[PDB]
């Protein structure tokens, strides 16, 4: 039924676009004026909220992936249940990344005067906070899921042999590069963005 709706929305978009284009009014579907006239606080607050939301839905994702297999693998070998908690920690740090980026973004969130409200800088710092919240929340989502998967494999290879956890912790390190790189990119994107003035 979802494929029927995906086809129906596509058919309605094609029929509306071709009807609007054939009648000489095709510039009325104006995405640029939509970007110019929507409020920058929508993009800013939506970016902050999706940053701290999608970091947490990746952190909590990885936490259950390498938590349920840690508890399952700890039934026969209970000497992993404290040492291997660093795999919970590596997928938990992607939430503090999104938190400390969301607070730094919300510091740039003041009341702009209505005479200069849809200005160049106010609209720039809405766009920048939106996409720099998206590129941090999605990167921490994907990093949390990857660290959870490579910690769920580590929690079972630890219970197999003790000398394997040191060898497969390296894969968790290379997986946890990603959230820190998103942490860097989201600070470079909203680095030149000013407050709302």
């Amino acid at each position: 039924f979802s494929h029927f709706l995906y086809y129906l929305v596509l058919i309605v978009v094609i029929v509306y676009g071709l009807y609007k284009l054939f009648t000489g009014h095709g510039s009325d579907i104006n995405f640029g004026k939509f970007l110019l006239r929507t409020s920058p606080y929508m993009w800013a607050n939506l970016g902050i909220a999706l940053c701290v939301g999608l970091s947490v839905v990746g952190a909590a994702w990885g936490i259950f992936i390498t938590g349920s297999s840690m508890i399952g693998a700890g039934v026969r070998a209970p000497r992993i249940t404290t040492k291997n908690l660093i795999s919970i920690i590596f997928c938990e740090v992607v939430a503090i990344y999104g938190l400390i980026i969301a607070i730094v973004f919300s510091s740039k969130l003041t009341v702009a005067t209505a005479e200069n409200m849809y200005s160049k800088s106010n609209l720039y710092t809405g766009y920048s906070l939106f996409w720099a919240g998206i590129t941090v929340g999605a990167s921490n989502l994907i990093c949390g899921i990857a660290v959870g998967i490579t910690g769920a494999t580590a929690a079972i290879s630890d219970a197999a042999d003790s000398a394997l956890f040191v060898k497969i912790l390296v894969i968790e390190i290379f997986g946890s590069i990603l959230g820190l790189l998103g942490l860097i990119v989201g600070l470079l994107m909203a680095g030149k963005a000013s407050e709302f003035q």
Binding site: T82, K83, L85, I103, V104, S107, L187, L188, G191
Partner: protein, 275 residues
């Protein structure tokens, strides 16, 4: 020190005659707790329910303890310190069940004649003697100041904890009498950590030291100072100290020279000692 030892040995049993990590834990774990748990009201409750177990440790020792209360009574001295530091830090904050304490003289005075319901500022008279100031309580922008203070507090205390626990590695490699491990891991680690985040922790203190309003200078942003120290070296938009643009290049080169040095010193000198 038994509860701290069990806490630190749950993670990893140390190797033979290594520096014990449960001997710096005995202060830092209740103190890093208290930085997160800062309140004289909740801290006194936790100190009181810990001191109830400390004063009654003879009747509770000869007793069958279930797992939760065995956890709580095995650490009856971790909770006494976790309450005793929480009272200290919640006296540093003005947070007594989320209320302020008008103990000392304030550094901020409010204007005497003002209309009702309007937004007013306070004029700085002095500085508050011990702890945070109590004129930030029912304040609109008090939470911005507490964000700045607690963020820089966390940065400096994490820097202090990391540079304190990094010296124990040097003491380990000195007790093992391995200068190869020292020159391969400690020194390229030390002048990589201190040249970036030691510089950040110094810059926070130096921004706190300068006035930036009496001097009529712009207060520099320290986030986009460390962003621009790696991206655009030598370009300083808001100058923080004299000689900044040429000293940050030296610190950047000292940090970047230790990425090949820490990676290439020890294997290439273990290979040289097999010839």
């Amino acid at each position: 020190t038994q509860a701290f030892q069990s806490i630190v040995d749950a993670y990893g049993i140390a190797t033979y005659k290594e520096i014990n990590a449960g001997l710096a834990t005995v202060v830092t774990f209740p103190f890093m707790f208290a930085i997160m748990f800062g309140d004289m009201g909740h801290g006194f409750i936790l100190f009181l329910m810990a001191l109830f177990l400390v004063l009654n440790e003879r009747k509770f020792g000869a007793m069958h303890r279930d797992e939760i209360f065995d956890m709580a009574f095995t650490g009856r001295y971790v909770l006494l310190l976790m309450g005793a530091f929480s009272v200290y830090t919640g006296l540093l904050y003005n947070d007594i069940f989320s209320k302020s304490m008008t103990i000392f003289k304030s550094g901020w005075q409010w204007p005497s004649t003002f209309r009702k319901g309007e937004s007013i500022e306070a004029k700085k008279t002095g500085v508050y003697p011990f702890g945070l100031d109590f004129a930030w309580h029912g304040t609109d922008n008090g939470l911005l100041f507490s964000n700045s203070y607690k963020m820089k507090l966390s940065i400096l205390m994490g820097y202090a904890h990391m540079t304190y626990s990094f010296m124990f590695s040097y003491i380990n490699y000195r007790a093992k009498n391995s200068k190869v491990d020292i020159i391969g891991n400690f020194i390229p680690g030390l002048v990589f950590m201190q040249s970036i985040f030691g510089y950040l922790s110094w810059a926070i203190v130096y921004k706190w030291s300068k006035d930036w309003i009496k001097d009529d200078k712009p207060a520099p942003g320290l986030l986009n100072m460390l962003i621009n120290m790696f991206l655009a070296p030598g370009t300083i938009d808001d100058q923080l100290y004299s000689g900044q643009a040429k000293l940050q290049v030296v610190l950047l080169l000292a940090a970047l020279v230790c990425v090949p040095w820490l990676l290439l010193y020890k294997p290439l000198t273990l290979r040289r000692l097999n010839k």
